[PDB]
Structure formats: C-alpha cells, structure tokens
Design a protein around this ligand. Structure first.
Ligand code: SAL
Length: 357
C-alpha cells in the first residue's frame, strides 16, 4: 500500500535533546498518485515532561491537535500575543509566519501533538525558522551581517555575537518551575483559542463506536485550509461499517489500540495499524476499521478538501442502498429485489457494529 506511511517514516529533523519533532515523508514522492495532498505535510511533535520548544515560525498553515498530555502554547504575532494551555483532544490553528513555542507543564505525563501543515512556497516544501537557538539549531539572526544586526538592535557586534551564538542545547530543552509557573500564568485565561474534539456531539454514533469531527463549516479556524479534524473512537472488538468519503482525502493515524483496515482501490489493500502509524484514505475509496487486541481503538485524522464532505456507508440500517429502489437492486445484483432488500436490511445497527471475534 502506497497509502500506508508507518510511524518509521517520520524523519526527526533537528537534534532534539529532550523529546523530538518528526516530519513524515512527502506524500507525493513515494507514489505520485497522492498529489492532491502534495502541498500537505503531516508531523508528530513530542515533548518530554517540563520540556520546551524554542520559539519559531513555519512557512505554511498549520493545525496542532493534542493526542496525549497537556501543556501551554504561546502564539506571537507582530502586534498580537496569545497564550493558551491545551488538554487532550484540543485543536488549535496556527497561521503561517506566526511565532510559536510549546511546553509540557506536566511533571509525569508526556506531550504528544499530531500536526498538519500545508505548504505555501513550494508544494510540500516546509521549513521551520527558529528565532531562538544558537548553534543548535542555527538562529536565522546569524544569517545577517554583524553590522546589519549592530545597526538594527543598536548593539555592538559583541553582545549580539554572544547572544545568538552561545546556545548549545537543541530545539527542546528543559524548563523549570520558576519558569513554568510564570509561563503557565501568562496562559491562565479568564471566562482564536483552542477547541476540544468533543466540543460537539458525535457526528455518528452507535453502541459500538463514536465519530467526532471538527468541520470548517462550523469552526472558522478551518475554513482557510478547508481541513477537518475528525476523531474516530471504536470500542473494543468493534468495527466501522464499510464507508467512503465524498470529496475528502483523510490523513488518519492511530492513537490508541490496534486497527485492522481493509480498503478498495478494485485492488484489496489490507493491513494492520499500530499506534503512531499513518494511513491516507483518498476520497471515494471504501474502507473499514476493526479493533484488534485487548485495548480499545481511538484513531484521529486530518481531512483535506473538507467542505461539504459527507460519509456514505455501504452497510447498516442507514446505508446508501436504502436510497436505491428495489428494481435498481434487481438489475444491480441479478436477483429478486425483495431478496437483496432483505439482505441489506437485516442489520439493525447503522454505523458501528461488533467486529469479527
Ligand atoms: O475516514 C475518515 O473520514 C476519518 C476521519 C478522522 C479520523 C478517522 C477517519 O477514518
């Protein structure tokens, strides 16, 4: 499967000492049929307890989704400052060129952030510009002549030289309570910000699973990217009835449990998905997920071209076939209509059912 990007294809970019930040492969290079998502790049940013990513800004519109833990983020713009703290499931939209720094304010729990970002300069070409740092990573402030910086900051080429250079530790370093308590107090708000993935009722739900989806049609933050952050919660031993998306290519990744998937291309692409593995579900392709293991099945994913995207189910009480009449069913499968109608209808459940034990 060219759609299957295992967790091992996440390329850790910078020398990150405490935790690390990993960029997944370009979707188009592995097999040039994933070119609708060629401008899109997915990443996974990982923060150990009491860590801290140096303030930077990416060229490209981003979307942070918190998968594990909690922490504090700070978005800095030319004439605007905002400090939010996030829990599990919180989605927040990062705009291009905006400066950002994170921190794991938890002393035992770890910080996992599932990240989406679309290019703006060259299709897929994504770069992080670090205003902080020293030698690791370089600070773009060291790409300017000393007399330029000396004339910009009004400072001799000594204090600036010792400032932007004297810094050894990587992107993610350790923070301390005297720093955190102040940082988290800037974040402490009263009475755009983040929104949890369960801010809504499940778009679809059964006694065996739930599906939450943040949509551009509701959340303004998502209208620019035309992206939807759906979250699919399958219960132990359960499954999603085979369905397909109308126009949205999804970039889905397992965050809890082991998922067994099958999908039509019609080549039958099958596989197993562990936590951290990425699967791409292009638009129109049917697919099903099954919880395989003692654990549950929680699995999150971004969706591009999200506006007006529906889900059409191919089985269950509410599938597309009820909206196809009897005679068309006869011509379709070359059997009596009341006979195939009694095949499609003897599943009383609609979206999530019991997977094969
Ligand atoms: O197929 C989807 O639309 C989807 C969206 C978000 C998470 C998991 C998913 O399968």
């Amino acid at each position: 499967n060219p759609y299957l990007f295992e967790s091992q294809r996440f390329r850790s970019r910078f020398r990150a000492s405490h935790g690390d930040f990993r960029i997944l492969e370009r979707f188009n290079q592995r097999s040039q049929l994933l070119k609708g998502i060629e401008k899109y790049r997915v990443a996974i940013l990982e923060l150990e307890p009491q860590s801290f990513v140096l303030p930077h800004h990416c060229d490209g519109e981003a979307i942070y989704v918190v998968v594990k833990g909690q922490g504090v983020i700070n978005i800095a713009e030319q004439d605007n400052k905002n400090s939010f703290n996030l829990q599990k499931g919180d989605v927040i939209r990062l705009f291009a060129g905006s400066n950002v720094y994170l921190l794991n304010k938890d002393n035992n729990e770890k910080l996992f952030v599932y990240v989406l970002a679309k290019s703006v300069n060259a299709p897929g070409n994504l770069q992080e510009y670090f205003s902080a740092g020293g030698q690791n990573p370089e600070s773009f402030y060291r790409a300017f002549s000393s007399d330029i910086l000396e004339s910009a900051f009004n400072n001799p080429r000594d204090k600036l030289e010792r400032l932007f250079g004297q810094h050894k530790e990587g992107i993610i370093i350790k923070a301390s309570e005297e720093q955190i308590r102040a940082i988290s107090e800037h974040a402490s708000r009263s009475t755009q910000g983040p929104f949890n993935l369960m801010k809504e009722r499940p778009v679809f739900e059964s006694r065996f699973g739930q599906f939450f989806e943040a949509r551009p049609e509701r959340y303004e933050q998502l209208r620019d990217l035309d992206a939807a952050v759906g979250f699919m919660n399958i219960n132990q031993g359960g499954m999603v009835l085979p369905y397909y998306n109308t126009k949205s290519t999804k970039l889905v990744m397992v965050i809890e449990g082991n998922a067994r998937f099958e999908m039509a291309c019609y080549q039958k692409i099958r596989g197993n998905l562990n936590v951290g593995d990425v699967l791409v579900i292009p638009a129109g392709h049917p697919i099903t997920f099954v919880a395989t293991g003692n654990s549950n099945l929680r699995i999150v994913g971004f969706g591009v071209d999200a506006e007006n995207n529906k889900k059409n189910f191919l089985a269950g009480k509410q599938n597309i076939w009820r909206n196809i009449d009897r005679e068309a069913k006869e011509l379709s499968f070359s059997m009596p209509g009341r006979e195939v109608e009694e095949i499609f209808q003897r599943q009383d459940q609609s979206y999530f059912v019991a997977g094969p034990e």
